[PDB]
Amino acid sequence: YDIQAWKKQCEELLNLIFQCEDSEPFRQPVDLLEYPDYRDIIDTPMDFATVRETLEAGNYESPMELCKDVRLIFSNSKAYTPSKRSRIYSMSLRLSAFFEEHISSVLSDYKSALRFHKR
Ligand SMILES: CN1Cc2ccccc2NC1=O
Numbered sequence: 001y002d003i004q005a006w007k008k009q010c011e012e013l014l015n016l017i018f019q020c021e022d023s024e025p026f027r028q029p030v031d032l033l034e035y036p037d038y039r040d041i042i043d044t045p046m047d048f049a050t051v052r053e054t055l056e057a058g059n060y061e062s063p064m065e066l067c068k069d070v071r072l073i074f075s076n077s078k079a080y081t082p083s084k085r086s087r088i089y090s091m092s093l094r095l096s097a098f099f100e101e102h103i104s105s106v107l108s109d110y111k112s113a114l115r116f117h118k119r
Pocket residue numbers: 025030035076077078080081082086087088089090
């Protein structure tokens with residue numbers, strides 16, 4: 001029932017994401033010189049370095065807020081892809097499946113801890 005445990009669990013999951021080859025396109029903000037129409041399509045850019053910096057600054061209150069920003073990385077990739085068969089988008093689908101498999105217990109434990117605090 002530790003209300004604070006989610007933070008270190010999210011730091012460890014971000015470390016695993018950075019080691020995976022499938023994160024390479026998503027580690028830093030999308031390069032606008034490479035993709036000059038990116039901001040005509042994508043209203044709110046997001047990347048894993050931004051997520052980690054937000055966490056380490058103490059600017060997430062819950063793992064739900066971190067989970068919203070990570071899902072935005074994947075939805076932006078889907079909106080920018082010319083094909084569902086693209087390389088970068090296919091890396092995004094494997095990395096999304098890995099993320100969802102590991103964040104499920106972080107969310108469940110946090111929400112259980114809050115309910116116990118309010119019992
Ligand atoms: C082919 N692309 C290009 C791309 C650039 C930046 C972010 C996401 C994507 N998605 C794609 O599938």
